[PDB]
């Protein structure tokens, strides 16, 4: 239990907004029994350069809590234990099909201003909760923006970004503007580049043959699309096992790049789909 106290008296509109906002994950860095206005939420970091991946890294470092039982200016945050059941109100604009794993993502800046809190040069920046599929999708897009923006053209950076950025998952359009192009993608691409070099050097003889053998036997239309992208074996089988194991491990590494740690596992969903129950903590 972490009690928050803002030291500043809030109005009835503020207590109505927090009553609307009850049962939401808020991350804290402090790990004390007491927190205040300075450490609550994500505003004490989102003034430093506003970089999405920077917020993502420190948000990985943060310690997550659940809002509970606001008694006026005092604000209970439960520290939720491992694998126990907890009720979460959602903020991500999604339809939230049950049983999927959930991660915790930096807030994608919508054009409309937030109505959560703005009080005395301090807002309540709440990070969103998303499914792991669209989380990995966003991380793919981050890595891809760096792969393209290491390459340099004039009036083509905008041509890549405006086509790529607006994505749709479960009838929801989101976008990520103003990428600073830091070297974050360069390191997290550099180990990918290393691993793709290893996939090249360690990939077996069966597999790139397996394309041509599959195509020369039979054909399918998605195989013809893969062909568009494309354009003796005398008992070496333990070597083949080892090479396929190495290629699989490189794919595990590049998957561990774009993967985000699942923070929640959904069991029951309300019909309004504002609150859902989970049984997980990392």
């Amino acid at each position: 239990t972490v009690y928050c106290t803002f030291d500043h008296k809030l109005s009835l509109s503020d207590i109505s907004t927090l009553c609307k906002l009850m049962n939401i994950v808020i991350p804290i860095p402090a790990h004390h029994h007491l927190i205040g206005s300075g450490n609550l939420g994500l505003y004490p970091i989102v003034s430093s350069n506003k970089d999405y991946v920077h917020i993502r890294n420190v948000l990985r470092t943060m310690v997550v809590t659940i809002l509970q039982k606001v008694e006026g200016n005092q604000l209970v945050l439960r520290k939720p234990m491992t694998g126990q059941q907890y009720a979460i109100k959602n903020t991500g604009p999604f339809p939230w099909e049950k049983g999927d794993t959930l991660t915790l993502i930096p807030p994608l800046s919508t054009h409309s201003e937030e109505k959560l809190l703005k009080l005395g040069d301090w807002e309540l920046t709440v990070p969103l909760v998303v499914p792991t599929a669209i989380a990995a999708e966003i991380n793919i897009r981050l890595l891809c923006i760096g792969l393209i923006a290491v390459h340099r053209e004039y009036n083509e950076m905008q041509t890549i970004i405006d086509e790529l950025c607006s994505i749709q998952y479960r009838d929801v359009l989101i976008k990520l503007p103003d990428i600073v192009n830091d070297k974050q993608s360069m390191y997290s691409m550099k180990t990918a580049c290393i691993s793709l070099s290893m996939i090249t050097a360690m990939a077996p003889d069966i597999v790139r043959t397996y394309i041509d053998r599959l195509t020369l036997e039979d054909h399918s239309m998605l195989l013809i699309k893969c062909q568009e992208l494309l354009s003796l074996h005398a008992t070496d089988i333990k070597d083949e096992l080892k090479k396929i194991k190495s290629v699989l491990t490189m794919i595990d590494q590049i998957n561990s790049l774009t993967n985000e740690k699942t923070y929640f596992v959904v069991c029951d969903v309300s019909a309004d789909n504002r609150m859902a129950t989970c049984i997980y903590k990392n």
């Binding site: 402090a30 790990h31 890294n57 990985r60 470092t61 180990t191 290393i194 691993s195 070099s197 290893m198 050097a201 360690m202 333990k238 070597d239 096992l241 080892k242 194991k245 190495s246 699989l248 491990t249 490189m250 595990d252 590494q253 561990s256 993967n259 985000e260 740690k261 990392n282």
Partner: protein, 251 residues
């Protein structure tokens, strides 16, 4: 009454546990064996830190003199003739209740704090001082740290040499930990990007990290162990909620 700790009774021949029959709280390793009568055989952390490459020659020969008999010589030969290390030996837990019979009985804790019974003198994990390092942005950041064990290999032109590291970090996230470990380990990593192609031994990575569990920041204390007068500097974690997780490899 109440316990809530998870233990396992253990039979192991008494030759391998030479100082670890005296100082409670040690990491233990499962070593499966193609010999069918001892299918599993249990290995001391210091016993495998013998042929770890991190350990300097003085500490290595000192604990080799703590670790010289015929049975240990044969087991070290078996470990060296194993191709890789990390899935022929394996992490198993923390020592409590040495019995020292003929074939000695060991309790071993999977989860929870390290205590036999009656909850007097709750023991702690004992790590050799050479074999750990804390790569982090700020050391001992705010509060309690997660303790991980990392196996790292090295290749000096003949064979593979394994190396045993222990990291202590405030980061819980395994992705953040492997991202700071690649920054620590990049040099020998590029050496293995050279090596793993020309190698034919069935391995696929540079090392792997696995969580032991929680510690406490104010419960880290220095000291030494001594068996037959061999003073050996150790850093003793005091109260440990043992929380094993999966192995996470990195290349």
């Amino acid at each position: 009454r109440e316990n809530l700790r998870i233990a396992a009774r253990v039979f192991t021949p008494c030759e391998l546990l030479a100082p670890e029959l005296e100082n409670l709280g040690m990491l233990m390793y499962r070593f499966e064996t193609d010999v069918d009568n001892p299918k599993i055989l249990f290995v001391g952390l210091f016993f495998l830190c013998s042929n770890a490459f991190n350990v300097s020659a003085c500490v290595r020969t000192a604990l080799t003199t703590m670790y010289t008999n015929s049975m240990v010589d044969n087991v070290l030969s078996m470990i060296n003739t194993c191709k890789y290390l990390e899935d022929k030996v394996s992490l198993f837990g923390v020592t409590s209740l040495v019995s020292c019979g003929s074939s000695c009985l060991l309790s071993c804790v999977m989860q929870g704090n390290v205590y036999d019974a009656n909850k007097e003198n709750i023991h702690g994990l004992t790590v050799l001082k050479e074999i750990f390092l804390e790569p982090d942005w700020e050391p001992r950041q705010h509060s309690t740290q997660y303790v991980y064990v990392v196996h790292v290999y090295k290749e000096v032109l003949s064979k593979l040499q394994y190396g045993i590291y222990v990291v202590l970090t405030s980061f819980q996230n395994e992705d953040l930990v492997v991202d700071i470990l690649r920054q620590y380990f990049e040099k020998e990593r590029f050496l293995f990007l050279n090596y793993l192609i020309n190698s034919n031994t069935t391995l696929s990575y540079f090392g792997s990290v696995q969580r032991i569990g929680r510690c406490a920041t104010e419960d880290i204390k220095s000291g030494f162990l001594q068996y037959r007068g061999i003073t050996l500097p150790v850093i003793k974690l005091e109260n440990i909620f043992v929380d094993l997780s999966e192995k996470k490899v990195f290349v």
